[PDB]
Amino acid sequence: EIIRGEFISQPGGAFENSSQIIIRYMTTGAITIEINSTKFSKLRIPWYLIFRMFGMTGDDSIIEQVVFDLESNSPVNTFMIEILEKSIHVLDPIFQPVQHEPNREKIIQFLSEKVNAVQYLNERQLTILDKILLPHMGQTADTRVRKLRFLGLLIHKILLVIMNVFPPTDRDSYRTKRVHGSGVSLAKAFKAIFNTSVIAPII
Amino acid sequence: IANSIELITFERLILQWHLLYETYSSTKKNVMYPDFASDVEWMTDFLENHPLLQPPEDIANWCIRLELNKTTMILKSISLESIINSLRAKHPNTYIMHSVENTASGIPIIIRIYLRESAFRRSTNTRMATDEKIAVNVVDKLLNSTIRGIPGIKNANVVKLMRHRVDAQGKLVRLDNIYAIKTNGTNIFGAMLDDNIDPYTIVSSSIGDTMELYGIEAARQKIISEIRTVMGDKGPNHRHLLMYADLMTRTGQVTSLEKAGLNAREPSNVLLRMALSSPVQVLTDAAVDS
Amino acid sequence: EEINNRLLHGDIMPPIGLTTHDFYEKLQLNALKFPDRILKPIMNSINPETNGLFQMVATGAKGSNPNMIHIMAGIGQIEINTQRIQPQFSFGRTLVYYPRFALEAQAYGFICNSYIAGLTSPEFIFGEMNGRFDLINKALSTSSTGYANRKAIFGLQSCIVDYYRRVSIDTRLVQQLYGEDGLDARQLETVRFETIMLSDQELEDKFKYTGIQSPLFEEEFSRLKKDRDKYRQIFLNVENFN
Amino acid sequence: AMQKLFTYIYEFIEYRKMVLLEEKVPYDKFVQMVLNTGFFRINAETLNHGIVSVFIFGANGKYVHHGGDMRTLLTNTLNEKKHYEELILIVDKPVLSKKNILDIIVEQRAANPTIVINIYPYHLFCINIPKVSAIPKHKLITQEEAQEFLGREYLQPQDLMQISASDPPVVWLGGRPGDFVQIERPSETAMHAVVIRFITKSKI
Amino acid sequence: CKNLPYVFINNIQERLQTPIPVYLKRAAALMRMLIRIELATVKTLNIT
Amino acid sequence: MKICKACSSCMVRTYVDGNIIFRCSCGESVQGDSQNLLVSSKVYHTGEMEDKYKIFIKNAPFDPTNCQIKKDCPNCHLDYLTQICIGSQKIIILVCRCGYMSNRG
Amino acid sequence: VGMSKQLAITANVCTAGEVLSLKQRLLSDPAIQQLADVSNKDIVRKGLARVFINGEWIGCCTNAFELAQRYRMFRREGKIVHPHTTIYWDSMVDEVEFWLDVGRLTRPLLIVDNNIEKYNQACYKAAEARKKGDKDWEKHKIPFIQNTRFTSQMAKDILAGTLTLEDLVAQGICEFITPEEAENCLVAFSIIELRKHKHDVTRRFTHVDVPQAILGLAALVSPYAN
Numbered sequence A: 001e002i003i004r005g006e007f008i009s010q011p012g013g014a015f016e017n018s019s020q021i022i023i024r025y026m027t028t029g030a031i032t033i034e035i036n037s038t039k040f041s042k043l044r045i046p047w048y049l050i051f052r053m054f055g056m057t058g059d060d061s062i063i064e065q066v067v068f069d070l071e072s073n074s075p076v077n078t079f080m081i082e083i084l085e086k087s088i089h090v091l092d093p094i095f096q097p098v099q100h101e102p103n104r105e106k107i108i109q110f111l112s113e114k115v116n117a118v119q120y121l122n123e124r125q126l127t128i129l130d131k132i133l134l135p136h137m138g139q140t141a142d143t144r145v146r147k148l149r150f151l152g153l154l155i156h157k158i159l160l161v162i163m164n165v166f167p168p169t170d171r172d173s174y175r176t177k178r179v180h181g182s183g184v185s186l187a188k189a190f191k192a193i194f195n196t197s198v199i200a201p202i203i
Numbered sequence B: 001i002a003n004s005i006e007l008i009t010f011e012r013l014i015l016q017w018h019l020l021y022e023t024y025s026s027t028k029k030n031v032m033y034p035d036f037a038s039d040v041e042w043m044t045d046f047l048e049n050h051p052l053l054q055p056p057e058d059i060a061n062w063c064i065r066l067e068l069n070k071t072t073m074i075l076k077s078i079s080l081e082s083i084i085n086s087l088r089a090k091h092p093n094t095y096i097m098h099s100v101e102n103t104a105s106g107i108p109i110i111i112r113i114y115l116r117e118s119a120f121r122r123s124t125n126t127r128m129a130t131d132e133k134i135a136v137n138v139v140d141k142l143l144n145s146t147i148r149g150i151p152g153i154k155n156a157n158v159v160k161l162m163r164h165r166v167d168a169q170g171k172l173v174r175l176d177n178i179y180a181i182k183t184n185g186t187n188i189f190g191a192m193l194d195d196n197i198d199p200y201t202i203v204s205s206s207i208g209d210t211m212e213l214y215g216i217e218a219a220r221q222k223i224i225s226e227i228r229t230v231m232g233d234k235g236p237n238h239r240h241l242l243m244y245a246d247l248m249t250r251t252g253q254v255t256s257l258e259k260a261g262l263n264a265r266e267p268s269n270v271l272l273r274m275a276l277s278s279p280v281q282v283l284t285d286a287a288v289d290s
Numbered sequence C: 001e002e003i004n005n006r007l008l009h010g011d012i013m014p015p016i017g018l019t020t021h022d023f024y025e026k027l028q029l030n031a032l033k034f035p036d037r038i039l040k041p042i043m044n045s046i047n048p049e050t051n052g053l054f055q056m057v058a059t060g061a062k063g064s065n066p067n068m069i070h071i072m073a074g075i076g077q078i079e080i081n082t083q084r085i086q087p088q089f090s091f092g093r094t095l096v097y098y099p100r101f102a103l104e105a106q107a108y109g110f111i112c113n114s115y116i117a118g119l120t121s122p123e124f125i126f127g128e129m130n131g132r133f134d135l136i137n138k139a140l141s142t143s144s145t146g147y148a149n150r151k152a153i154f155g156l157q158s159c160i161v162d163y164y165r166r167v168s169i170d171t172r173l174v175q176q177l178y179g180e181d182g183l184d185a186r187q188l189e190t191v192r193f194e195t196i197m198l199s200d201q202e203l204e205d206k207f208k209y210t211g212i213q214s215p216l217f218e219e220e221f222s223r224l225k226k227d228r229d230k231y232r233q234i235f236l237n238v239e240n241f242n
Numbered sequence D: 001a002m003q004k005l006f007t008y009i010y011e012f013i014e015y016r017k018m019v020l021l022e023e024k025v026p027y028d029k030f031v032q033m034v035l036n037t038g039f040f041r042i043n044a045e046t047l048n049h050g051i052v053s054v055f056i057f058g059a060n061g062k063y064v065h066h067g068g069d070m071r072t073l074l075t076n077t078l079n080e081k082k083h084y085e086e087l088i089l090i091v092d093k094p095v096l097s098k099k100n101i102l103d104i105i106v107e108q109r110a111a112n113p114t115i116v117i118n119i120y121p122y123h124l125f126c127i128n129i130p131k132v133s134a135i136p137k138h139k140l141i142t143q144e145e146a147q148e149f150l151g152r153e154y155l156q157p158q159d160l161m162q163i164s165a166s167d168p169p170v171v172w173l174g175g176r177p178g179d180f181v182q183i184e185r186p187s188e189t190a191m192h193a194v195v196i197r198f199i200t201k202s203k204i
Numbered sequence E: 001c002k003n004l005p006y007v008f009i010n011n012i013q014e015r016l017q018t019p020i021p022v023y024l025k026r027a028a029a030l031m032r033m034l035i036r037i038e039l040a041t042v043k044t045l046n047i048t
Numbered sequence F: 001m002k003i004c005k006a007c008s009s010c011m012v013r014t015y016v017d018g019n020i021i022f023r024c025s026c027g028e029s030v031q032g033d034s035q036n037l038l039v040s041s042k043v044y045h046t047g048e049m050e051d052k053y054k055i056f057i058k059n060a061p062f063d064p065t066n067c068q069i070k071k072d073c074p075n076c077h078l079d080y081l082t083q084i085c086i087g088s089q090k091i092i093i094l095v096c097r098c099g100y101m102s103n104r105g
Numbered sequence G: 001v002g003m004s005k006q007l008a009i010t011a012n013v014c015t016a017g018e019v020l021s022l023k024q025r026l027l028s029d030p031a032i033q034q035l036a037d038v039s040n041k042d043i044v045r046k047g048l049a050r051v052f053i054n055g056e057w058i059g060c061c062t063n064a065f066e067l068a069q070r071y072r073m074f075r076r077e078g079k080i081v082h083p084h085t086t087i088y089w090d091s092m093v094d095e096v097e098f099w100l101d102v103g104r105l106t107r108p109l110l111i112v113d114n115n116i117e118k119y120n121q122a123c124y125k126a127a128e129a130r131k132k133g134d135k136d137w138e139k140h141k142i143p144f145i146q147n148t149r150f151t152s153q154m155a156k157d158i159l160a161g162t163l164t165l166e167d168l169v170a171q172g173i174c175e176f177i178t179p180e181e182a183e184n185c186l187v188a189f190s191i192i193e194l195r196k197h198k199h200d201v202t203r204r205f206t207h208v209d210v211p212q213a214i215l216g217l218a219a220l221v222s223p224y225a226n
Ligand SMILES: [Zn+2]
Pocket: F004, F006, F007, F008, F009, F024, F025, F026, F027
């Protein structure tokens, strides 16, 4: 790997569940997003697939979301495109058959296996993804464009770090840390046992 | 001498290089990239000034354009003639255009290398790799080419040394005016092959290089010296360093103080090696080996 | 501040190999150093005959000169990894108490106070940074040493002296003679060889006995000369591969 | 590399006490031979009237890259009527890594067990190895002296410290496996020091 | 000085004057030189 | 780079010996003009101060945490001018909230 | 091992705020444009600044610094913004964050206020007189002043128990600063430093702190620790 951009998204208060959306950058030039949740837990889904799943067909717009522009001649803007263009042609080992499928439905189907009956499969997996991807933005599934724009923001920040525009996030700094009391710690084990004690009589 | 010794790769002198995928020839008047279309002025001139050298017509339609840093060339005291001679001698596979002759500041020094079919045709051997990708291998090879200096020496700084020497009177006198070069990498062979350096006194901090070039005894002395250096001011007695070196050079080859090293010095000692680490693997190998 | 003005006007010209930032940092670090005359006011105030702290330091019983200088005169520049306090609070800041791009030495770890005088808050923070660095280094050093200690012990375990005074591993020689001298490490004392550095004429004047005109004394002096030459040749060679 | 080897290869012959059987040629002619033929050959006779042949292979040569070319060269040379004693083949260090050339070397040795065939890199002869400061004074001792030393110490040859036959100082001395080399080390604890090592098989 | 290397052997071999190994001679060389320096005829002129 | 008008998608850069040509998964391949000859350009320059700090320079006079100097603004005639030492080159760029940026454009 | 870390004397962990209300106010009020209205090209072309609340990019605004200052003034007022909200403005990138999370360390700090607006206005007038023939431009120039509103009388009241921190924050004397918002603050390490630079316009302080605040009780037990 080159670097890893990790973003744990939690909606509402600390007692809601969290989604650890990782954004890696492979040495070969591939950009993969790992949901690292209940579903797609170990699936390194290339970013452009994630963009098309939600309904982003045009590749030019897909690049735009990351770069927020497609005509400015900023050296930062330019270099970003070459990094991103090579990403499209990475030929990933997994998702290769689905790698260049214009049909939105086909892209969704391939994941379902890796996890109008097709509409149900799409209506299932896409809603699942909406619930799993960036919950803090919302889960109505009508804000998908906003989720994609924020994803592009993340790609832009990570790529800027690649180019050395900015330094990597400082771990020790307390600006990005938080101190949780007993309630947060208790709620953790409570979810496991309380559900466990509730599932046991379900059988 | 130190300036001469230091490795000067070609990439150090480039300001910006480009890959254009173009062919140069008076036939068909092949178009060029608009920014570099202005090169036509000295493109044809080079042939007029150097008629003996002309395009072999083996052009692979892959070309390199390289602007040179005049400031670096002046600083390093290297002339374009040496650069082109080294590039051509070490890369017969391509045709080199000296292009811009040395000028006053304002006229950039430019170089245009055209790749011949010889290198590209070889692609079929290993794989059907596209000629585009074998081209970037070639540009990297050109960038890494050594214009001057001993390979493997990043830096070289003159250092004041203190050394004794018996004078004519027969008195051992310490001399503090002696100067010497302290490099940043290790190449004993290169330093040996390069005059202006006393080949018989080359000293390296590398144990492997010393072993390879000089022998096991030199490697032993090098181990002693390096451990003593690592010890610092509060170092142990010398006999302990001697113990370390003698054990590590017992078999005629430098052996480690690790599982691999022990297995080479005391292979039959199954129990000792079991105690060190990996008891189950050692026991299995001992049992199968009997 | 003079160096700071030089930087402000752009008069800082780094030498080859150093960037302007590194050259400026080195120049400021050299500028901020006690003149070694700081000891004069300390010694003027204290009475060597009846000052307990000074007597403890000077006899070597405990303490050092930098200790006295810090206690009485001033702590001076804090140096971590032989460098000032690198900006880490923010992009340009070193602490919340200083502007983003501050030229003052106080912002990069210079303490103008003394322990007896009482440090201010930022000086205290810098001192604690230095202390935590030292403690961390000690702990990591010990932790790293232990593992290599065990590996070396098992590597060298089987080297035992034998009845020939050699060192061997189950009859397989590791040394023809322990330490090449066959001596215990705790039965040695440093001694000086006079003839090593003497000149030819000095050696003849000092050691050639001329009381009796006999060849035996010439032979003895020749033996001394041979030994001197052997010592020089061997240990001059040690210089040439060190 | 080539210029240094030419001047020092003959010193290696001189150190081994051999005598050259051909007249020395100028450096320009020597190099010229390397490009056209791919190798330069020097023949010397030992004290016992054995014949030692040295082959210096320049880079970008057919012999280095093709095993068949080496096979014909070695076979034809060995079939000669000279009373060969050793065949020294000096090559570029990358050549040593190549497996095919080495396979040519090993098979040839089997065909002629009596003859010794060795292959060395350039750097072994690009310097007067005995005169290096960091290399102690190696020396070969007769089997009788080594036997006396072992008998006085109740030792076996397998008990001594081992030194490879490819060791540059040993290569210059000419010792073969099963022989003993006496090394006069400089020691800091004690001024002098002497050890005896057992020459083992040369690597490669 | 000649018999010094025998310290690595018993006193029996010293009496019989049997051959001394070269490595033992080397081991004793340094102390031999020091003894020569510190017991030079000039130095020990008053010793009985 | 190039997006085929049939479908917005990256056009793989596969040159034909006679002249440059571009292709997509959908086809519609289009030749390459003179400007597309350049495939790989690299420039050896230290830092990206042109825009690496562009936004920072804009906001610097409005950031209270920034150092300041007693020099004067040529436009506003204020007694103080914000200072910043940006980059390993140690470039000192005095700035005012008015937009006046000394030592630079 | 000593991996444990002790909180400072004034350090106080913070409770989760009411993000819904602040988000409603932010999106409803002007100077903020919803993501629907703006476009990814639009922000770059117009140099718009993104606005984050609890890490959620709600929208964008024309000027980051102006909005951040306005909302900090609102917080000091206590009218619209809870005193514990973290208003962080990034200058390296045009961003305006609003964290109401749980687990943010917070410490009270005394606010340093000055009269720069008057200083600047008189500065313009003095320069104009320079162009004129008045030759008394200096009379228009006035000295800079930065001074906290803490008063010796109020300090006595605190010891008497009449005045509490909540009342200090109620007035504009004090406000809580988290390590995030600390990056936007220049703090005088002690009242001595604030007075030393009372009239210095080169160094304007945002807050002043009591130097004892950088130690916990365990460390504060030792006397003359410095
Ligand atoms: Zn297409």
